[PDB]
Structure formats: C-alpha cells, structure tokens
Amino acid sequence: SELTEEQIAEFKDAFVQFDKEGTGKIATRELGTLMRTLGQNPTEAELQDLIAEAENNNNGQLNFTEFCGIMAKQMRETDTEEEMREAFKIFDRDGDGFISPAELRFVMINLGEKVTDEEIDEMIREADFDGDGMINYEEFVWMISQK
Ligand SMILES: [Ca+2]
Ligand SMILES: [Ca+2]
C-alpha cells in the first residue's frame, strides 16, 4: 500500500527473482506474474500496454523504476481505475449503462466545466466505436484518458 522500507524490499526481492536476461531488468512477460504474487492487480489493458509496447523494442525488459512506478500508482489507492468508473456513473444520469449527449451536458455543468452540446457530442463520437451515440464504461475510459 506504500513504498515503505519493508515493502520496497518485498517487491525488490520478487523483482530480482524473475531477472532472466540479467540486464538488471526482468522480462515484461513476468510483470503480470509478479503482480500476482504481490498484492498488486492492474487492469488487463494496462499489463497489455507495457507488454505490447515493450513487446518489440528491448526483448520486453523492465527496470526497478518501471515496476515500482506502477506500484506507486496502485499503492496510492488500489488501481486508480475506480475513480474513472465513478465519474462514468455520474455522467450517466440513467441506469441503462450508457450515456447520452444530454446527460453529459448536465453533469459537466455540475462539475464546473461549461461545455457546448457540440464539443461534447464530438467527444462522444470519437469514443463511440460500436456506433450508437452512447458511452459505456469502456468508451468512457478511452475519452477520459485523453484529458
Ligand atoms: Ca444514460
Ligand atoms: Ca457506444
């Protein structure tokens, strides 16, 4: 839950335990497994982001700063993902599971970000892949990450 003396030594140990290449780094294909043996638990997409980016660049290796970096984020709370899902619910005045330009227009005002039905309507289309003019926790995570 924090980078405390013991905690640091905890994952730092589990870090050198997976050191294959020996370049002071561990293969990305081991990070997830490292997050399993540890109280860590990111999002499928996240672990895929690193493995995919590092997939073909440096045999997929990680540094103490790389792992501890993500651990720093998760430790800060749990995953920081719940914060976005929460805003999604807010932006969703209905319980249907999707958001409409109208709802989006009402909430943004609640927060304090005065927006025009046009600017946000566009942000919805850019996030709407399936094609329904509505936003789901998935389409939401995408557009919000653009902030
Ligand atoms: Ca709705
Ligand atoms: Ca949609």
Swiss-Prot record:
* Positions with a binding annotation for Ca(2+) 4: D128, D130, D132, M134, E139
User: Per UniProt, where does Ca(2+) 1 bind?
Assistant: D19, T23, K25, E30
Q: Does the keyword Calcium apply?
A: yes
Among Gene3D superfamilies, the record links this protein to: EF-hand
Query: What GO terms in the biological process aspect are recorded for it?
Result: actin filament-based movement; microtubule cytoskeleton organization
Indicate the segments forming the EF-hand domain, all copies. 6-41, 42-77, 79-114, 115-147
The residues that hold Ca(2+) 2 are N57, N59, Q61, E66
The domain of life for this entry's organism is Eukaryota
Q: What keywords appear on the UniProt entry?
A: Calcium, Metal-binding, Repeat
Q: Which GO terms describe its cellular component?
A: cytoplasm; investment cone; myosin VI complex; nucleus
Binding residues for Ca(2+) 3, per the UniProt record? D92, D94, D96, E103
- Name one matching Pfam family: EF-hand_7
| Example of a GO MF term | myosin VI head/neck binding
Q: Which PROSITE patterns match?
A: EF_HAND_1 (PS00018), EF_HAND_2 (PS50222)
Q: Which purpose does this protein serve, as stated in its record?
A: May be involved in calcium-mediated signal transduction.
The record's family statement is: Belongs to the calmodulin family.
Q: What is this protein called?
A: Calmodulin-related protein 97A
Q: Which gene encodes it?
A: Acam
